[PDB]
Symmetry: C3
């Protein structure tokens, strides 16, 4: 079975749903006007997500794992960047 | 092992915990006064959840997956509060 | 297979907590603005979820750790991590 993770923000709301399927994580997006495919596409067998607002600006962190390696992906308004997270 | 997803809201808080076990997802609930089994019962091998407030009203989305098929389930509302009635 | 994670965050700094189940043990990595560090949480589990809420400026965290058909709730309220009253069934 695929594995999903979800976040949301605001009152509209916006929702982002990440799905790990066959070693790849993809993103479906809701901003009030229908589901669409988001920009996020990265390798992983497992996904988690959290997000927070700074005023009206959304920040998202997606944790993608394959084997024992977890990579953090960051959305801070300009598209996705690798974060500093290490699992240790 | 069973797989869970959790969400919470307010400052009481209210918590909802969803558990996928043997292809069924069930819901346990906390609103300050003990754990109880919720109405949510739907098929799934994997679950995620998110929730947001609009004023006092909570809105919940549960993402239930079996195979490659993810179904979104939706609920919302206002929990129990004392009303204006007086016997005057 | 792959490790399994859960994440929560609060405030605007923000603070982030990332729980990882790896080979039957869940550990915690923490961000409070100044670098990632290993947290106090360390308990058994193959699967993990988490939620948290603020009461004013006080964070409260609940981690749901599952092994087999047993899910244990762990509570962070300022007294270390304690076992909560959650059970999966009546
Ligand atoms: C916030 C939205 O709520 C309903 O409109 C659903 O049909 C959508 O899929 C979304 O969850
Ligand atoms: C907040 C951002 O919203 C859309 O632009 C998506 O395409 C990105 O992947 C991200 O989720
Ligand atoms: C909130 C922080 O944002 C960026 O600085 C990342 O590189 C960190 O790992 C963290 O996610
Ligand atoms: C909120 C707390 O932050 C750090 O003190 C961690 O070591 C604890 O495990 C908890 O996450
Ligand atoms: C919010 C509540 O906090 C404690 O009372 C736990 O024992 C409960 O199970 C619940 O998590
Ligand atoms: C918010 C709602 O609380 C109720 O008591 C539950 O039975 C519903 O399934 C839902 O979680």
């Amino acid at each position: 079975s695929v594995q999903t993770a979800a976040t949301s923000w605001g009152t509209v709301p916006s929702i982002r749903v990440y799905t790990a399927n066959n070693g790849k994580i993809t993103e479906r997006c809701w901003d009030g006007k229908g589901w669409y495919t988001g920009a996020f596409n990265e390798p992983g067998d497992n996904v988690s997500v959290t997000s927070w607002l700074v005023g009206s600006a959304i920040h998202i962190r997606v944790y993608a794992s394959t084997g024992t390696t977890t990579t953090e992906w960051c959305a801070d308004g300009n598209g996705w960047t690798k974060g500093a997270y290490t699992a240790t």
